[PDB]
Design a protein around this ligand. Structure first.
Ligand SMILES: *[C@@H]1O[C@H](CO)[C@@H](O[C@@H]2O[C@H](CO)[C@@H](O[C@@H]3O[C@H](CO)[C@@H](O)[C@H](O)[C@@H]3O)[C@H](O)[C@H]2NC(C)=O)[C@H](O)[C@H]1NC(C)=O
Ligand SMILES: *[C@@H]1O[C@H](CO)[C@@H](O[C@@H]2O[C@H](CO)[C@@H](O)[C@H](O)[C@H]2NC(C)=O)[C@H](O)[C@H]1NC(C)=O
Ligand SMILES: *[C@@H]1O[C@H](CO)[C@@H](O[C@@H]2O[C@H](CO)[C@@H](O)[C@H](O)[C@H]2NC(C)=O)[C@H](O)[C@H]1NC(C)=O
Ligand SMILES: *[C@@H]1O[C@H](CO)[C@@H](O[C@@H]2O[C@H](CO)[C@@H](O)[C@H](O)[C@H]2NC(C)=O)[C@H](O)[C@H]1NC(C)=O
Ligand SMILES: *[C@@H]1O[C@H](CO)[C@@H](O)[C@H](O)[C@H]1NC(C)=O
Ligand SMILES: *[C@@H]1O[C@H](CO)[C@@H](O)[C@H](O)[C@H]1NC(C)=O
Ligand SMILES: *[C@@H]1O[C@H](CO)[C@@H](O)[C@H](O)[C@H]1NC(C)=O
Ligand SMILES: *[C@@H]1O[C@H](CO)[C@@H](O)[C@H](O)[C@H]1NC(C)=O
Ligand SMILES: *[C@@H]1O[C@H](CO)[C@@H](O)[C@H](O)[C@H]1NC(C)=O
Ligand SMILES: *[C@@H]1O[C@H](CO)[C@@H](O)[C@H](O)[C@H]1NC(C)=O
Ligand SMILES: *[C@@H]1O[C@H](CO)[C@@H](O)[C@H](O)[C@H]1NC(C)=O
Ligand SMILES: *[C@@H]1O[C@H](CO)[C@@H](O)[C@H](O)[C@H]1NC(C)=O
Ligand SMILES: *[C@@H]1O[C@H](CO)[C@@H](O)[C@H](O)[C@H]1NC(C)=O
Ligand SMILES: *[C@@H]1O[C@H](CO)[C@@H](O)[C@H](O)[C@H]1NC(C)=O
Ligand SMILES: *[C@@H]1O[C@H](CO)[C@@H](O)[C@H](O)[C@H]1NC(C)=O
Ligand SMILES: *[C@@H]1O[C@H](CO)[C@@H](O)[C@H](O)[C@H]1NC(C)=O
Ligand SMILES: *[C@@H]1O[C@H](CO)[C@@H](O)[C@H](O)[C@H]1NC(C)=O
Ligand SMILES: *[C@@H]1O[C@H](CO)[C@@H](O)[C@H](O)[C@H]1NC(C)=O
Ligand SMILES: *[C@@H]1O[C@H](CO)[C@@H](O)[C@H](O)[C@H]1NC(C)=O
Ligand SMILES: *[C@@H]1O[C@H](CO)[C@@H](O)[C@H](O)[C@H]1NC(C)=O
Ligand SMILES: *[C@@H]1O[C@H](CO)[C@@H](O)[C@H](O)[C@H]1NC(C)=O
Ligand SMILES: *[C@@H]1O[C@H](CO)[C@@H](O)[C@H](O)[C@H]1NC(C)=O
Ligand SMILES: *[C@@H]1O[C@H](CO)[C@@H](O)[C@H](O)[C@H]1NC(C)=O
Ligand SMILES: *[C@@H]1O[C@H](CO)[C@@H](O)[C@H](O)[C@H]1NC(C)=O
Ligand SMILES: *[C@@H]1O[C@H](CO)[C@@H](O)[C@H](O)[C@H]1NC(C)=O
Ligand SMILES: *[C@@H]1O[C@H](CO)[C@@H](O)[C@H](O)[C@H]1NC(C)=O
Ligand SMILES: *[C@@H]1O[C@H](CO)[C@@H](O)[C@H](O)[C@H]1NC(C)=O
Ligand SMILES: *[C@@H]1O[C@H](CO)[C@@H](O)[C@H](O)[C@H]1NC(C)=O
Ligand SMILES: *[C@@H]1O[C@H](CO)[C@@H](O)[C@H](O)[C@H]1NC(C)=O
Ligand SMILES: *[C@@H]1O[C@H](CO)[C@@H](O)[C@H](O)[C@H]1NC(C)=O
Ligand SMILES: *[C@@H]1O[C@H](CO)[C@@H](O)[C@H](O)[C@H]1NC(C)=O
Ligand SMILES: *[C@@H]1O[C@H](CO)[C@@H](O)[C@H](O)[C@H]1NC(C)=O
Ligand SMILES: *[C@@H]1O[C@H](CO)[C@@H](O)[C@H](O)[C@H]1NC(C)=O
Ligand SMILES: *[C@@H]1O[C@H](CO)[C@@H](O)[C@H](O)[C@H]1NC(C)=O
Ligand SMILES: *[C@@H]1O[C@H](CO)[C@@H](O)[C@H](O)[C@H]1NC(C)=O
Ligand SMILES: *[C@@H]1O[C@H](CO)[C@@H](O)[C@H](O)[C@H]1NC(C)=O
Ligand SMILES: *[C@@H]1O[C@H](CO)[C@@H](O)[C@H](O)[C@H]1NC(C)=O
Ligand SMILES: *[C@@H]1O[C@H](CO)[C@@H](O)[C@H](O)[C@H]1NC(C)=O
Ligand SMILES: *[C@@H]1O[C@H](CO)[C@@H](O)[C@H](O)[C@H]1NC(C)=O
Ligand SMILES: *[C@@H]1O[C@H](CO)[C@@H](O)[C@H](O)[C@H]1NC(C)=O
Lengths: 120, 426, 421, 118, 121
């Protein structure tokens, strides 16, 4: 009910309740370039979620543990006392390590599930 | 203990430069206020100004393609004086020029006689001719189509999906730095692409007080954009009952020119009041004193010479490009009527090679117009901040459009994020 | 009943929609009734705009005739002229340009009277028509205007519904509906009073009009049989050409070998009489069995709208049509030839059709008519119809009337007993 | 065939969802048409995704059916109606249903997030 | 680690561990837009085809279609340890459409069975 980015200045534990509002707002040569680049950004994000095994979800839990070197904070100060913009700035240039770990964890999970489903 | 949880739809963004849509395609506006946010704005790094400049140039160039070329009119002119009653100030300003123009038939010429402004012709000595059109030795002249108007029409810039536009609502916002009262829009408000060179016409007014904006207030090479909180009205007129005639110069080429002037000829003047202009300049000086010494004398002066398109203050009143003289407006140290010259062959912006001919409109032209801002330039600290002199200097047209786009920033939405939770997948 | 919302993707439903179709060059739907309206079909507007744009793009990169807008000295043709052709042709002479810019030349040529207008001069007599209104561009002699079937195809996510009902009057429900991605091959045939080389009705003549009681609208008559029209211009035209500039070429009629006769177009008397009988039999269904139907001559306009235009081989044949209609319920119909034509109904442009060598003789199938009702409020039961003209859309609306563009809405919901855990 | 089941009853047309699928994806006008088809496909896929129905053609949900939307029984709905007539009947409530579906997913993931946090 | 197509000449078993590296490289003036639209259409057709089979969101998808010995009678050791994906793809030419049809039919039956199982109170 807050609207697009209305929760942007709210805390992470409150802004996380409005993910569908943000998701629904993501979708002559210049106009086609703008539409194609919007489609490409959406598809790259969806493919990246699929690689992690999070396709079809907005809140996706994973098997990658949190490193204290990425952000040495407790859940209360992360979720109740700061916004997603401040968090995004705080963990800048740590996201590529997290993405690589998520990719490797999903590859291992897919192999383990295939082997479990291969037992008679 | 804690695990990485991936979120999609995270309300965060990064600064970005993307392609914007021009809507006018009438949008249904929406605005979402962002509570508890701060966003850093920089009006002099805003790509929306460069994109608006490119869009106006492209629309202008496209509008003049399906129109009549004046190539056959690049001929020698036999110019004499106008036989009507003129004043001393207009002696030599308007000439009665005869020439041989083409017709629809390739082998049948036609004698013509047309009044031209002196600024639109250049001396050229021959046995039977005295002048030629100013642009014929530089570029082709294209006549603007009489069915296409010049008058600004407000347009909206809209971000594509995946992007958003942030609007700063803070009072006394100087164009840079943090902004707290920030809202999200998809499209900008209606912005009039008003063309002017020294004063900003029909623009936005400041909510609270006169706002002085400068990329570097101590650098005299940068322009100072002053936005007023109250408007100052300008009454402009060309008091001449112009009679417009036309001739056919080709199979589908119709040319329009001044035929005659009915009655006596009087000069073309803009009237600005004196009480409100004095109050406006007092407010501007009071705001200037906050960026300089409190006891420094602030004086206004005339603009420098060179490049008439810059030294004078342009409009597009009616359909005819004026060029007024602000020397009688800024001649003060801290009504009023401004002699305005008229041109028909206009090289707009700072381009060379594309000359447009603005056809005359029959009758008198009078327009009233809100002055919403000023462009000032400082002469330089030659007195070590003892006395400062400001002039109504010119600049690129980007500075006028930036004076409207200063409140808007384009940001790219980043729906993905990660965060620690106690939630473990299995 | 403990029912839950179940979401289905791939739902076979659709909505009426207007989308962009592309050019190119069938699944029956049982128990489907679909409401059609040929006068709300945006495929005709798209076909009209596409043909205008294609024509303009084809004409643009071609030789301009701007240097030929000069005065001409025109005299009478010295060949054997029949009684009907007197004053229709002139032997005109005009100096012109040459590949070089410092020289000129003399170009005798034979023009039709319709292509030139008298001027006020003492040395020259005529000008080319429209030189005082717009530039004349010659249509490149390689490219042809011969109708080529064009298939209109929907984008993915859209479908075209085709009505197969017999005696379908253009509006209302259709019971026999099929789904296609592309239409059949539709020829963009240009004509005015009579519709040539179109499709035929399967069972009977179909009268299609919007608000038939309002005589201001046009009536499209689609025949179930064809009427063969045999048109010819019996003249062996010898064509010459001149440079008029670097890389340019202008083509004109040089002379006529043999006698000069008018462009006669033949129409079988019996077949046409039967066709008009069928038309009045169908009109009486909408006007009454005791209503006398008169077919009168077209009037109320210039040559472009009061005659039957009909490209044949290149040259545009404006046939009078006086030998058709002209009745109350072989025809060697005279036709005029025009060379500086203004197609569509524009003004700002003009096209010069270069003459084609030899004798021109076409054979075309009349598959429909455009009629207009004279109107009035006398209750005389003596309605009069004329082969009136109209917009070019009415020819393209004489096809594409059985096709509708629909948007597919594959997402939907329905109650089921299925609950997600 | 494509849309062949449009005139069939919904109980029979629901078994041809893969036939209706695949026809949604396959000079400037052709490019605009392709971009428009892709945009509509992605809007529908995102709309399914925010409901927890991604990757499925028949997706069961946790939103109960309101008798004010339609008071027909399942025999009448599935055996005596086509999808076109059903779509016409409940169009005026479709967006309301969509909103409820979205809300259910908003709750569902949170519950799953808590269940996996034990 | 091996790059975009570095595993192309490796065995099918070894190459099956590099699916994400190739998956990332499928997505990233009029002719440039045409090329981008063609890339998007190919990606979306492949994702849709996986979705029809019930494999959406997975790069390795197990199914319920038994392997027919008439398609290939090699044992798993020969297919996975002694053969590459290019040679295998050549071997199963003229059979992929039958496999795709069987996968589509199997997923339709799976969806109906899941809907009926979820309809039990
Ligand atoms: C700033 O805004 C004012 C207010 O809109 C502009 O003045 C108005 O301009 C319009 C458009 O040119 C004028 O309408 C014209 O009126 C004449 C009357 O003869 C008519 O012939 C034209 O066809 C057109 O309708 C209108 O009169 C005028 N109104 C006022 C109160 O001034 C002004 O031009 C703008 N200034 C700039 C620099 O853009
Ligand atoms: C501009 O010059 C033309 C001549 O080139 C003037 O036209 C003549 O005006 C006189 C006025 O007494 C007439 O008697 C002549 O018959 C006019 N000649 C033609 C050819 O028109 C015209 O009046 C001049 N205009 C001005 C404003 O001085
Ligand atoms: C417009 O055309 C006239 C045509 O008569 C020009 O007048 C003649 O110009 C030639 C040279 O070009 C002179 O030798 C004649 O004596 C002129 N005739 C007269 C009666 O004066 C006239 O000069 C042309 N005007 C311009 C400005 O080019
Ligand atoms: C261009 O020339 C044509 C030919 O003279 C003009 O059309 C004629 O206009 C007169 C006006 O008195 C009419 O009486 C004739 O019936 C017209 N004849 C034809 C064949 O059209 C036309 O008006 C001219 N157009 C312009 C803009 O000057
Ligand atoms: C802004 O901060 C105040 C501080 O308590 C809080 O109450 C308010 O809810 C915040 N704004 C939003 C949109 O959450
Ligand atoms: C991540 O955690 C491991 C131990 O769990 C540690 O060795 C490593 O340094 C951490 N990452 C970074 C970037 O420091
Ligand atoms: C989280 O860490 C901050 C850092 O000082 C501390 O103030 C706060 O009390 C901590 N909260 C919890 C719940 O441990
Ligand atoms: C990585 O991110 C942190 C977050 O503040 C930043 O301080 C650090 O400089 C970044 N690393 C580099 C190499 O810039
Ligand atoms: C026109 O008249 C002014 C004075 O009235 C004179 O200075 C000027 O030279 C004259 N011009 C011509 C071309 O006769
Ligand atoms: C055209 O003429 C003007 C007249 O002063 C001159 O200044 C300009 O340089 C000329 N153009 C060129 C290209 O020389
Ligand atoms: C605008 O005001 C802020 C207030 O702190 C200041 O930091 C900033 O430098 C100012 N910018 C300009 C361009 O005056
Ligand atoms: C932001 O500006 C608007 C402009 O009307 C005002 O109504 C609103 O109260 C302002 N917000 C704050 C937080 O002051
Ligand atoms: C404009 O600013 C001046 C500054 O002194 C103030 O007195 C005046 O009331 C302001 N006007 C408006 C309309 O805000
Ligand atoms: C730009 O602003 C800074 C701020 O103090 C000033 O020191 C500097 O001299 C300015 N630039 C120029 C070119 O004067
Ligand atoms: C002239 O200017 C004054 C003040 O700028 C304005 O109030 C008035 O309406 C104008 N009058 C005319 C006739 O233009
Ligand atoms: C401008 O002022 C002059 C001075 O008398 C006056 O004649 C003229 O009418 C004024 N213009 C307008 C538009 O009011
Ligand atoms: C404006 O008028 C003053 C009056 O002294 C004059 O010096 C100045 O040159 C004029 N402006 C222009 C651009 O000629
Ligand atoms: C100019 O004079 C003519 C004389 O016929 C008159 O009809 C017209 O209205 C006048 N125009 C103006 C603007 O005074
Ligand atoms: C000019 O200012 C006045 C002052 O109230 C305002 O009412 C009027 O609408 C303004 N006109 C334009 C064209 O902005
Ligand atoms: C040409 O034919 C016309 C037809 O009426 C006639 O009026 C004219 O006199 C004829 N001229 C010659 C030279 O035969
Ligand atoms: C066309 O046929 C339908 C059949 O239902 C009828 O309702 C409609 O009035 C007819 N329209 C015309 C113009 O004959
Ligand atoms: C529909 O039309 C086609 C045309 O050939 C015909 O074969 C078919 O039997 C018709 N079906 C019905 C139900 O009228
Ligand atoms: C065409 O329709 C008419 C109805 O008047 C009928 O008599 C004739 O036999 C039909 N022709 C064919 C070939 O079906
Ligand atoms: C049809 O024409 C009649 C003529 O009187 C008119 O009254 C009626 O409104 C028209 N209907 C439509 C739908 O155009
Ligand atoms: C014209 O009609 C005849 C018989 O009426 C037919 O044999 C021929 O194929 C038709 N041609 C066209 C082009 O319709
Ligand atoms: C026109 O006259 C010329 C004069 O030599 C002649 O050669 C030519 O054949 C004539 N053309 C016609 C069509 O009579
Ligand atoms: C048309 O009919 C006439 C009848 O006299 C005949 O002479 C002529 O050759 C026929 N032409 C064609 C093309 O059938
Ligand atoms: C038209 O010409 C063809 C050529 O074979 C002929 O068979 C046919 O009978 C002719 N028809 C008429 C009406 O002249
Ligand atoms: C005309 O007569 C026929 C004869 O059967 C009849 O079927 C038809 O309905 C009649 N039409 C009118 C308008 O009276
Ligand atoms: C058609 O022929 C008749 C015969 O009397 C004639 O009156 C009519 O004007 C001709 N049509 C045209 C458009 O000239
Ligand atoms: C048209 O009909 C009238 C009615 O008598 C007749 O005299 C005339 O000859 C007919 N003309 C044609 C060309 O059929
Ligand atoms: C026209 O006459 C020329 C004379 O040589 C001849 O070669 C040509 O074949 C004739 N054209 C036709 C169509 O018979
Ligand atoms: C249409 O309805 C009949 C009614 O018996 C049914 O048998 C037939 O299967 C239906 N059509 C389809 C395509 O299901
Ligand atoms: C069903 O809908 C009505 C209004 O359409 C609403 O008042 C009612 O609460 C809904 N049912 C439930 C169970 O919420
Ligand atoms: C469903 O409702 C209709 C009401 O028309 C009724 O006839 C039918 O028997 C009902 N079906 C069941 C299974 O109760
Ligand atoms: C939907 O609403 C419109 C007007 O809001 C109404 O005309 C229509 O009948 C409604 N649909 C149904 C199925 O009740
Ligand atoms: C290529 O083949 C050799 C066979 O000995 C194998 O060891 C090597 O790993 C293969 N290459 C790759 C990239 O796996
Ligand atoms: C394999 O394909 C053949 C082809 O006819 C078929 O008969 C056989 O049943 C298939 N195998 C299985 C296990 O279904
Ligand atoms: C697989 O088949 C090949 C060829 O028949 C054979 O050499 C190999 O031993 C087989 N392996 C197994 C594990 O059956
Ligand atoms: C597939 O069919 C072609 C058709 O000739 C054949 O050449 C090829 O060998 C077949 N594929 C296999 C794997 O046998």
């Amino acid at each position: 009910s807050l609207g697009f980015l209305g929760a942007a200045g709210s805390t992470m534990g409150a802004a996380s309740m409005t993910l569908t509002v943000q998701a629904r707002n993501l979708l002559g040569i210049k106009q086609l370039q703008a539409r194609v680049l919007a489609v490409e950004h959406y598809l790259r994000d969806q493919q990246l979620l699929g690689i992690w095994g999070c396709s079809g979800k907005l809140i996706c839990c994973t098997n990658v543990p949190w490193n204290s070197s990425w952000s040495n904070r407790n859940l209360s100060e992360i979720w109740d006392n700061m916004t997603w913009l401040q968090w995004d700035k705080e963990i800048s240039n740590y996201t590529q390590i997290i993405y690589g770990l998520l990719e490797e964890s999903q590859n291992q999970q897919e192999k383990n599930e295939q082997d479990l489903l291969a037992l008679d | 203990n804690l695990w990485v949880t991936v979120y999609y739809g995270v309300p965060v963004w990064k600064d970005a430069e993307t392609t914007l849509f021009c809507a006018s395609t009438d949008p249904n506006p929406q605005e979402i206020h962002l509570e508890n946010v701060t966003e850093e704005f920089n009006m002099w790094k805003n790509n929306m100004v460069e994109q608006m400049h490119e869009d106006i140039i492209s629309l202008w160039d496209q509008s003049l393609k399906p129109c009549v070329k004046l190539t056959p009119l690049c001929v020698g002119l036999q110019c004499t004086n106008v036989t009507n009653n003129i004043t001393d100030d207009m002696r030599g300003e308007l000439k009665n020029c005869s020439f041989n123009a083409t017709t629809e038939l390739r082998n049948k010429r036609q004698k013509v006689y047309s009044l031209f402004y002196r600024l639109d012709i250049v001396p050229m000595v021959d046995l039977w001719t005295n002048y030629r059109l100013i642009s014929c030795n530089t570029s082709a002249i294209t006549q603007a189509c009489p069915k296409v108007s010049f008058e600004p029409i407000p347009i909206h810039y809209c971000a594509p999906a995946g992007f958003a536009i942030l609007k700063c609502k803070d009072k006394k916002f100087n164009g840079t730095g943090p902004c707290q009262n920030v809202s999200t829009v998809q499209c900008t408000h209606g912005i009039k692409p008003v063309v002017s060179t020294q004063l900003l016409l029909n623009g936005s007014l400041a909510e609270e007080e006169v706002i002085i904006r400068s990329e570097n207030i101590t650098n005299n090479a940068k322009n100072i954009l002053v936005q007023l909180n109250t408007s100052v009205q300008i009454n402009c007129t060309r008091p001449n009952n112009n009679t417009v005639k036309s001739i056919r110069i080709g199979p589908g080429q119709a040319f329009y020119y001044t035929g005659d002037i009915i009655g006596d000829i009087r000069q073309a003047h803009c009237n600005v009041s004196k009480a409100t202009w004095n109050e406006t300049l007092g407010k501007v000086v009071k705001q200037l004193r906050k960026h300089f010494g409190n006891n420094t004398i602030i004086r206004f002066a005339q603009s420098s010479g060179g490049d008439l398109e810059v030294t004078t203050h342009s409009f597009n009143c009616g359909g005819e490009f004026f060029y007024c003289n602000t020397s009688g407006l800024f001649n003060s140290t801290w009504s009023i009527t401004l002699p305005c010259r008229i041109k028909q062959i206009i090289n707009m912006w700072q381009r060379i090679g594309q000359a447009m001919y603005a056809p005359p409109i029959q009758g008198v032209i009078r327009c009233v117009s809100n002055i919403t801002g000023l462009i000032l330039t400082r002469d330089g600290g030659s007195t070590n901040s003892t006395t400062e002199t400001f002039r109504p200097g010119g600049g690129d047209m980007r500075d006028n459009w930036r004076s409207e786009l200063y409140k808007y920033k384009v940001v790219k939405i980043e729906p993905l994020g990660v965060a620690p939770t106690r939630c473990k997948r299995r």
